[PDB]
Design a protein around this ligand. Structure first.
Ligand SMILES: Nc1ncnc2c1ncn2[C@@H]1O[C@H](COP(=O)(O)OP(=O)(O)O)[C@@H](O)[C@H]1O
Ligand SMILES: Nc1ncnc2c1ncn2[C@@H]1O[C@H](COP(=O)(O)OP(=O)(O)O)[C@@H](O)[C@H]1O
Ligand SMILES: Nc1ncnc2c1ncn2[C@@H]1O[C@H](COP(=O)(O)OP(=O)(O)O)[C@@H](O)[C@H]1O
Ligand SMILES: Nc1ncnc2c1ncn2[C@@H]1O[C@H](COP(=O)(O)OP(=O)(O)O)[C@@H](O)[C@H]1O
Ligand SMILES: Nc1ncnc2c1ncn2[C@@H]1O[C@H](COP(=O)(O)OP(=O)(O)O)[C@@H](O)[C@H]1O
Ligand SMILES: Nc1ncnc2c1ncn2[C@@H]1O[C@H](COP(=O)(O)OP(=O)(O)O)[C@@H](O)[C@H]1O
Ligand SMILES: [Mg+2]
Ligand SMILES: [Mg+2]
Ligand SMILES: [Mg+2]
Ligand SMILES: [Mg+2]
Ligand SMILES: [Mg+2]
Ligand SMILES: [Mg+2]
Lengths: 150, 150, 150, 150, 150, 150
């Protein structure tokens, strides 16, 4: 159904490079509806619980360090199959392997400076949305373009 | 040679969403030549003949109903391998499964609101071109940029 | 009411340079609705009545021969103040003097190869629309984006 | 100095039309730095104090009514001469009179559905920023592209 | 005729900000032909000769220092009225006062970091072209799209 | 270290169709740094050594005559994995089989008119770079966007 939601965040590098609008426009053009949006500098606690699944990984320290080094634009998009779709639009972990047309493929060059984060499953999205957004910062009733769904 | 032709149609959703020029420009930039172009509100007979191969499918009634609910911009492009190349540019039937960079991948979310129709083979193109366009509405003399072909 | 219409034509040079889609997209983004659209090769009779006010001018002969020299995509847009607005978007007669952001300013360099034509008044528009299009070729039910008008 | 700030808001119509990213990208490309961003549905009280200077005007009721009818993306951009510059980039009150290249000129057609609001002076900006944003939602230390300022 | 030429240079800020292709594409779309193109780090002698008319101005020292701090992409375009048309596309000296749609208007904020240099007259163009380009680095045979000129 | 370089050349058809800027912009957005750039008309000697691995092929004769038939803009980009990445961005040899989003996929239709050349390995790149550019024509101090690399 047309009510699935995913969490996306323009990372510090994406924000410093002036890519916020370009990224949001891709999702709007696709037809997803913005239900949550804000800019904040992540707190070390937010970053660690956000990337909690990687806590025992070698790159964890630098990641948390990086994500907390500058502003991040956090957003939640709503639509049919938005979690898997937003991932397809993002590309793969290494931007060098990401196909042109995707966000990482078009703008990235390094795994550690890969512009944007996207939830990889509905469980993660629900978990991540709850982590970054309060219920009052999310639109309750969404009304998409009527020409989008049958 | 480079005289192959295909029939493409911006469906009512694509027209209402203001995507006609975006779609046309994609094919012009590729190097394909426009030999026919018109806007019309398809009739139920045209809709049913156009999609005759799906007349037994559960979605036919709704397809035909949607294709006739509003204006469509019908067009025919010419150039080498245009039938298969235009399909590649369109994406796949389900927009969510279409790669970023393709038309359906970039703009659609629902199978039923997938923006554009493109002939799936040369035999289909000939059938669909004859169905939507009268002979005199098609350019007889075509001239593609001279830097496109060897 | 905001049902004003203007006639626009992408001239043979505009069509040859692959600017049809780009031009249509500018009017679609603006919010105007396409109510008639077709590609054809103008007849001398048509070109001569179209540019009737210019017969005593030295460029008339060249003008007519050029407009009848290849495909032209003809269209009629509808919307509040479309006539004057589409003119502002086109630029001025000399493309070199047209401001960057207008169609002629962005794409043209010569007065005789100035990409597009637009009616200059509602009187000229009604007259030109009836010249290029038969009544049944124009949409009767116009449904513009509901976010466009108050 | 490079520390002036202005308040911009993508109005409900701009948000429903999928223009948020396109608008933010124009300001990022210009070099202004985003210091505040959020989406919210305005409260009738916020709207009235925001447009307080028009309280005795005929259109006031519909404006407040409209601004409160759907989500608005509120933002504050920082840079040298950003208040007057953002206005120039926005266009004039009536989008029909706005030049192509500006936001209203490119996307608008009606005075009441003019896509975006921008502070008209530094006094208004300071007043409006304070109205929509809490001090903790604004970046304190801004670091622009070093290639932007001498 | 259409053999007029102008010298344009993407300054070090424009190069560092990744605006070279955007700038070149603007002139290619207009219909101007590239007859010379190179990237070089200007020498202090070149910088001072190029900007000789400003040698008494308080900002000369800093101008020359900036123009030599990094790579510049020097280029020459040919076409009818290219000198004045390219200036119009560039904007005015102060980017904040440049109209949206022009290069400086769209991308710059500081007079000292205004992205691009364009010759201000034919006499200046001839001087600057001879100063930055050796004869053999310029195309002798130029061929503009045949749909550009009457 | 991430100082890998690749040689790219916009072929005469790419230059004639006005795609130089568009092509450069794709590599600039990606984060790669232009370290050499020039426009020239290739000499038969140069074209023949460039495409040396193809002398026994039936298309070699046509290939060489074409590359020496008009201006070519030559360039060298530097960045992490630039060689393989620029190839992914180019597409494949047959433009019709290149995926939408790649340069050849977006703009080409014929194998012999495929817009751009890119080195296929670091070995070929070092070899091609030394063929088209003298050492002093290439930047020595490379300062990429600091947000690009870890
Ligand atoms: N081996 C690695 N080296 C450096 N940083 C890494 C590595 N793999 C993961 N990262 C970083 O960690 C973030 C979370 O990683 P992961 O969840 O595996 O990928 P994705 O972000 O694509 O979901 C990635 O976006 C990336 O910035
Ligand atoms: N299972 C489905 N549910 C609803 N509509 C469908 C479905 N499959 C196809 N359609 C609609 O039928 C149109 C025709 O289908 P088909 O010819 O299979 O695909 P394509 O349009 O990609 O050639 C589709 O483009 C879509 O609008
Ligand atoms: N001095 C001229 N020389 C050549 N062609 C001209 C001249 N003046 C006008 N034209 C051509 O005649 C067309 C119609 O003229 P006019 O109605 O004056 O301009 P517009 O097209 O801006 O309304 C022009 O668009 C241009 O193609
Ligand atoms: N006469 C009018 N008719 C309808 N609504 C109006 C009128 N003038 C002002 N408005 C609306 O009120 C908002 C605030 O108006 P104003 O401050 O005058 O213009 P601006 O928004 O350009 O600063 C405008 O953006 C517009 O939506
Ligand atoms: N008052 C100023 N302060 C600092 N730099 C200036 C000033 N005026 C001009 N400049 C710098 O000098 C360059 C040359 O100036 P000028 O020839 O007057 O303008 P333009 O570059 O628009 O032709 C400008 O483009 C800008 O970089
Ligand atoms: N079958 C062919 N017919 C015509 N031209 C060809 C053919 N194969 C290759 N070419 C031309 O030769 C150029 C160099 O060939 P190759 O190295 O195989 O491809 P690529 O350019 O993708 O690396 C091609 O880019 C294309 O211009
Ligand atoms: Mg992950
Ligand atoms: Mg089908
Ligand atoms: Mg006229
Ligand atoms: Mg106001
Ligand atoms: Mg000057
Ligand atoms: Mg090769």
């Amino acid at each position: 159904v047309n009510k699935e939601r995913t969490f996306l965040a323009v990372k510090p590098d994406g924000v410093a490079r002036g890519l916020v609008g370009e990224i949001i426009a891709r999702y709007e053009k696709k037809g997803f509806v913005l239900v949550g949006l804000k800019q904040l500098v992540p707190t070390k606690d937010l970053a660690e619980s956000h990337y909690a699944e990687h806590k025992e990984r070698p790159f964890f320290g630098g990641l948390v360090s990086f994500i907390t080094s500058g502003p991040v634009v956090a957003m939640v998009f709503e639509g049919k199959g938005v979690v898997a779709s937003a991932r397809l639009m993002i590309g793969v972990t290494n931007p060098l392997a990401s196909a042109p047309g995707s966000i990482r493929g078009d703008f990235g060059v390094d795994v550690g400076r890969n512009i944007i984060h996207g939830s990889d499953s509905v469980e993660s999205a629900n978990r991540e949305i709850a982590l970054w957004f309060k219920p009052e910062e999310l639109l309750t009733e969404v009304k998409p373009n009527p020409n989008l769904y049958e």
